[PDB]
Design a protein around this ligand. Structure first.
Ligand code: HEM
Lengths: 431, 55
């Protein structure tokens, strides 16, 4: 009714839904693709993909289980999904996979069939998924020589250099209990799981903490992947944003909300009450964009992302947009702010209140790791609404106005201008 | 000369023509800059600029 949180060594967390047809259990390791290193990159995405190799996934397929997995930057998750009654059928199959079995998934016929498929995997991504590719490199340059930089799915380089002796090197350090959280989502009780958990003995590497690295940092920089053979142009730009559990966590998400997200095709999109939109549409400066305030444990990235078949006029594209961003400091309409608060809520909803347990897991697992607990929607909303204009005019005033940016891109970006232009559009001339 | 020698009708036309002409240079500097414009500047490498332009 307010989400449960109790620890007997294994911090056991759950979240009940009485109208759910199914449920899900799993673990979340409080160390992700940003706890790795330059040459072991993709180790966390390698771990995910053995966990779903036909072997272990045929086991749980007779049982009636489905497994879910994802790696982030600050965190890393291993979830299993099934019918709510077969709730022990989950917990046991989890127990087998992470304390019982070890080299049953770590075969020299398994691992050389997973790594020979996480290699094709990260060779369609950087090959044909430019919007994320661009998005990923954006981190690489903004957070260069620092934790967040390492692409979550790992470089094809440090991904052909890795054997099983390396899957473990990360496992036995960062796959602990004092870095994990067990989650219960969907259609199960707190007294169903934490019972079935204290039912099982053993302890893996107790007392052990996972290790640390130099805290992340940010620096104004570019990286440009020109490719004049690609029909469009993809660009992503940002400033040093705000972390998870930062005073302006919501203030910053409200700002993103204002300019928001465009799709020049859906007539619905064309009518949004966004000021910037007035400009961009005249000549069709782009095909779409969208904003964001990506928050991570140590640092953040407020900016936006755009694709465009309009090559001669990208220079305006970036211009109109970064000028709008100036208003946030000097001239944002209050009535804009309300449409923000309003729309944030709708978005922040379909995020948190989707009828899909697997999401409510990672969400829970990550948050109850970093701050300890989760924060309720009513808590969030109570904050969103407190937000004045002055909220947004002092946040932009430090974060946005005349601060270093972080551009990245690919496709026909000859037209995308230089760094002393772009960066300079962070401000406006004053008397 | 306007007469027997470089005399008075001379320095007076030399003043007037001194006024006129600099506007002719400026007129001409404009076509000069127009030519410059349609090809853009060269480089201390005598190769093509079109791969690494800045504004
Ligand atoms: C009123 C006198 C002049 C003005 C205002 C002028 C102006 C300019 C300017 C602004 C440029 C671009 C910057 C540069 O490339 O230096 C340029 C380049 C050039 N000028 Fe002139 N100029 C003058 C005299 C001349 C003369 C006397 C010549 C030849 C007899 C000449 C031939 C050229 C050429 C061929 C270029 C291209 C240089 C390159 O490729 O970098 N200009 N001029």
């Amino acid at each position: 009714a307010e989400v449960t949180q109790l620890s007997n060594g294994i911090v056991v967390a759950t979240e009940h839904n009485p109208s759910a047809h199914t449920a899900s259990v799993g673990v979340v390791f409080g160390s992700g693709a940003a706890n790795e290193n330059p040459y072991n990159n993709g180790v966390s995405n390698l771990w995910k993909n053995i966990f779903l190799s036909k072997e272990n996934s045929a086991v749980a397929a007779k049982e009636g289980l489905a497994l879910s997995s994802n790696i982030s930057r600050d965190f890393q998750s291993y979830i299993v999904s099934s019918l709510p009654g077969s709730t022990d059928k989950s917990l046991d199959f989890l127990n087998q996979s992470f304390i019982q079995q070890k080299a049953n998934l770590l075969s020299s016929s398994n691992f050389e069939a997973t790594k020979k498929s996480v290699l094709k995997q990260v060779q369609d991504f950087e090959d044909n998924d430019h919007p994320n590719r661009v998005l990923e490199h954006l981190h690489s340059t903004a957070f260069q020589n620092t934790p967040l930089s390492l692409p979550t799915r790992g470089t094809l380089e440090s991904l052909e250099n890795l054997v099983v002796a390396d899957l473990e090197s990360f496992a036995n350090n960062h796959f602990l209990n004092s870095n994990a959280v067990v989650v219960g989502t969907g259609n199960i009780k707190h007294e169903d799981l934490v019972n079935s958990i204290e039912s099982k003995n053993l302890s893996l590497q107790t007392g052990t903490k996972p290790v640390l690295k130099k805290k992340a940092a940010f620096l104004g920089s570019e990286v440009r992947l020109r490719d004049d053979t690609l029909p469009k142009a993809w660009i992503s730009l940002a400033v040093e944003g705000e972390p998870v559990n930062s005073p302006n966590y919501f203030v910053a998400k409200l700002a993103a909300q204002i300019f928001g997200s465009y799709n020049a095709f859906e007539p619905a999109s064309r009518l949004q009450g966004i000021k910037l939109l007035d400009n961009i549409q005249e000549y069709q400066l782009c095909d779409n964009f969208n904003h964001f305030s990506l928050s991570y444990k140590d640092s953040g990235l407020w900016g936006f992302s755009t694709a465009t078949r309009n090559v001669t006029m990208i220079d305006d594209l970036i211009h109109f947009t970064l000028k709008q961003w100036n208003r946030l400091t000097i001239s944002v309409t209050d009535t804009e702010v309300e449409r923000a608060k309003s729309l944030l809520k709708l978005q922040l909803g379909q995020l948190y209140e989707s009828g899909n347990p697997v999401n409510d897991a990672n969400l829970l697992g990550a948050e109850v790791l970093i701050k300890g607990s989760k924060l309720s929607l009513g808590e969030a909303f109570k904050k969103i609404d407190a937000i004045t204009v002055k909220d947004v005019k002092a946040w932009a005033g430090k974060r946005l106005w005349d601060q270093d940016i972080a551009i990245a891109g690919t496709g026909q970006i000859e037209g995308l201008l230089d760094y002393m232009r772009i960066r300079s559009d962070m401000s406006m001339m004053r008397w | 000369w306007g007469g027997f020698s470089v005399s008075n009708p001379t320095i007076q036309r030399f003043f007037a023509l001194h006024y006129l002409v600099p506007f002719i240079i400026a007129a001409m500097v404009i076509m000069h800059l127009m030519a410059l414009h349609i090809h853009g500047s060269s480089n201390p490498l005598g190769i093509t600029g079109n791969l690494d332009r800045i504004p």
